[PDB]
Enzyme design. Structure first.
Site, PDB file in Angstrom:
ATOM      1  CG  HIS A  28      -2.052   5.934   3.646  1.00  0.00           C
ATOM      2  ND1 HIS A  28      -1.138   4.898   3.533  1.00  0.00           N
ATOM      3  CD2 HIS A  28      -2.730   5.782   4.817  1.00  0.00           C
ATOM      4  CE1 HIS A  28      -1.322   4.165   4.598  1.00  0.00           C
ATOM      5  NE2 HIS A  28      -2.262   4.630   5.422  1.00  0.00           N
ATOM      6  CG  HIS A  37       1.389   5.746   7.654  1.00  0.00           C
ATOM      7  ND1 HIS A  37       0.630   6.858   7.953  1.00  0.00           N
ATOM      8  CD2 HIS A  37       0.533   4.687   7.723  1.00  0.00           C
ATOM      9  CE1 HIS A  37      -0.626   6.521   8.164  1.00  0.00           C
ATOM     10  NE2 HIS A  37      -0.710   5.185   8.001  1.00  0.00           N
ATOM     11  CG  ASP A  46      -4.103   6.352   9.044  1.00  0.00           C
ATOM     12  OD1 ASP A  46      -3.788   5.745   8.015  1.00  0.00           O
ATOM     13  OD2 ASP A  46      -3.718   5.934  10.161  1.00  0.00           O
ATOM     14  CG  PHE A 103      -2.180   0.877   1.158  1.00  0.00           C
ATOM     15  CD1 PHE A 103      -3.204   0.652   0.249  1.00  0.00           C
ATOM     16  CD2 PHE A 103      -2.334   1.937   2.032  1.00  0.00           C
ATOM     17  CE1 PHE A 103      -4.337   1.513   0.290  1.00  0.00           C
ATOM     18  CE2 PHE A 103      -3.457   2.759   2.052  1.00  0.00           C
ATOM     19  CZ  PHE A 103      -4.488   2.547   1.161  1.00  0.00           C
TER      20      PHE A 103
HETATM   21  C1  LIG Z   1      -1.877   0.559   6.938  1.00  0.00           C
HETATM   22  C2  LIG Z   1      -3.327   0.417   7.369  1.00  0.00           C
HETATM   23  C3  LIG Z   1      -3.527  -0.005   8.799  1.00  0.00           C
HETATM   24  S1  LIG Z   1      -4.357   1.947   7.095  1.00  0.00           S
HETATM   25  C4  LIG Z   1      -4.401   1.588   5.326  1.00  0.00           C
HETATM   26  C5  LIG Z   1      -5.733   1.638   4.586  1.00  0.00           C
HETATM   27  N1  LIG Z   1      -6.867   2.343   5.156  1.00  0.00           N
HETATM   28  C6  LIG Z   1      -8.085   2.222   4.603  1.00  0.00           C
HETATM   29  O1  LIG Z   1      -8.248   1.537   3.586  1.00  0.00           O
HETATM   30  C7  LIG Z   1      -9.272   2.883   5.239  1.00  0.00           C
HETATM   31  C8  LIG Z   1     -10.458   1.957   5.384  1.00  0.00           C
HETATM   32  C9  LIG Z   1     -11.562   2.676   6.192  1.00  0.00           C
HETATM   33  C10 LIG Z   1     -12.756   1.784   6.407  1.00  0.00           C
HETATM   34  N2  LIG Z   1     -13.027   0.869   5.262  1.00  0.00           N
HETATM   35  C11 LIG Z   1     -13.971   2.538   6.903  1.00  0.00           C
HETATM   36  O2  LIG Z   1     -14.983   2.496   6.200  1.00  0.00           O
HETATM   37  O3  LIG Z   1     -13.893   3.135   7.988  1.00  0.00           O
HETATM   38  C12 LIG Z   1      -5.857   0.151   5.050  1.00  0.00           C
HETATM   39  O4  LIG Z   1      -6.654  -0.743   5.194  1.00  0.00           O
HETATM   40  N3  LIG Z   1      -4.515   0.138   5.364  1.00  0.00           N
HETATM   41  C13 LIG Z   1      -4.017  -0.649   6.480  1.00  0.00           C
HETATM   42  C14 LIG Z   1      -3.026  -1.786   6.081  1.00  0.00           C
HETATM   43  O5  LIG Z   1      -2.905  -1.963   4.885  1.00  0.00           O
HETATM   44  O6  LIG Z   1      -2.462  -2.413   7.032  1.00  0.00           O
HETATM   45 FE   LIG Z   2      -2.572   4.175   7.387  1.00  0.00          FE
END
Ligand SMILES: CC1(C)S[C@@H]2[C@H](NC(=O)CCC[C@H](N)C(=O)O)C(=O)N2[C@H]1C(=O)O
Ligand SMILES: [Fe+2]
EC number: 1.21.3.1
Length: 327
Positions: free
Chosen positions: A210, A266, A212, A207
């Site tokens: 971004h 991050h 948060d 990923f």
């Molecule tokens: C790095 C993170 C913790 S944060 C990043 C990324 N974040 C998101 O997609 C937000 C999802 C919000 C959620 N569906 C809602 O409706 O409230 C994700 O997942 N990622 C995680 C990962 O890939 O570990």
């Molecule tokens: Fe994140």
């Protein structure tokens, strides 16, 4: 190079020792002004059991169940599921999969559900007989991490020179927009290259960079190093710690504080390992508005316009999909 991510004993934030609470607040302040990450330790939550129950779920749910729970990005029949439900993998293309759920109090009779207010949905759950105890476990986990988050918000408030309920008075069981995401990052052999992104510096990622979309993010992850934070010094590795919660600010905090507490940038490195990422996104209520301020200015005034949490959130969630893709 390893990022500075201090371990902060947050247990005083659950109690009545005000001086001890201020000493925790200082640590939060320092971490927030440095890399923007810290580990909350002595948080009281049984994370091993969280991990085990999540593993039981991820490893036993079936393709049929996944379709039946799927958000609208994967299943056109479920037009009301924008946030809550199953986010499918795409073998050969997308490795990650996940399950998101919202406030258990968003029931069909909840006034925001009745009004069809954006970002509010009724959770979907698999069959109880196929996943005995799972819904109950997940709902109680929501309230356990809610409690931890409320204590952390007291710490942030104090850190910013405010009374301890400054944030927490907008974080309420009947209306919080907070979400739990149970993310599965699988081990795959061969690992599909389309599921591996490459950063400008060459780092293989799952990923991209971004900020948060949250006030704060309260994250459990398995003990497999993967996260990196951007610092003036470049991207730095965040050490794993499967006994703590990794805490960072989201862009609503950055807005409210006029970037005094930045939302750190991050990213997630690609690791070919079966692991778990279990964030709790601390979101306020739909109509919550906190007046922006600036703790660096003598009069604390900021030239930012007030922004309601629901406006923030609706806009942010879409933006993040458009930037880094549909998870
Ligand atoms: C790095 C993170 C913790 S944060 C990043 C990324 N974040 C998101 O997609 C937000 C999802 C919000 C959620 N569906 C809602 O409706 O409230 C994700 O997942 N990622 C995680 C990962 O890939 O570990
Ligand atoms: Fe994140």
């Amino acid at each position: 190079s390893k990022a500075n991510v201090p371990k902060i004993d947050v247990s005083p934030l659950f109690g009545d020792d005000q001086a001890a609470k201020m000493r925790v607040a200082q640590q939060i302040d320092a971490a927030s002004r440095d890399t923007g990450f810290f580990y909350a330790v002595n948080h009281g939550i049984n994370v091993q059991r969280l991990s085990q129950k999540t593993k039981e779920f991820h490893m036993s749910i079936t393709p049929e169940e996944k379709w039946d729970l799927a958000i609208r990005a994967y299943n056109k029949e479920h037009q009301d599921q924008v946030r809550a439900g199953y986010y499918l993998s795409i073998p050969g293309k997308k490795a990650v999969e996940s399950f998101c759920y919202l406030n258990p109090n968003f029931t069909p009779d909840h006034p925001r559900i009745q009004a069809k207010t954006p970002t509010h949905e009724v959770n979907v759950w698999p069959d109880e007989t196929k996943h005995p105890g799972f819904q109950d476990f997940a709902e109680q986990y929501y309230w356990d991490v809610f409690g931890l988050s409320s204590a952390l918000l007291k710490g942030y408030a104090l850190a910013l020179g405010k009374e301890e309920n400054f944030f927490a008075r907008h974080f309420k069981p009947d209306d919080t927009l907070a979400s739990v995401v149970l993310i599965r990052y699988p081990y795959l052999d061969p690992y599909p290259e389309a599921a591996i992104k490459t950063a400008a510096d060459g780092t293989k990622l799952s990923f991209e960079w971004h900020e948060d979309v949250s006030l704060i993010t309260v994250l459990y992850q398995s003990n497999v190093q993967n996260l990196q934070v951007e610092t003036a010094a470049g991207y730095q590795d965040i050490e794993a710690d499967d006994t703590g919660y990794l805490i960072n600010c989201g862009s609503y905090m950055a807005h409210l504080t006029n970037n005094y507490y930045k939302a750190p940038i991050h990213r997630v490195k690609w690791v070919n390992a079966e692991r778990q990422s279990l964030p709790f996104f601390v979101n306020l209520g739909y109509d919550s508005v906190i007046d922006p301020f600036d703790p660096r200015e003598p009069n604390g005034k900021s030239d930012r316009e007030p922004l309601s949490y629901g406006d923030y959130l609706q806009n942010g969630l879409v933006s993040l999909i458009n930037k880094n893709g549909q998870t």
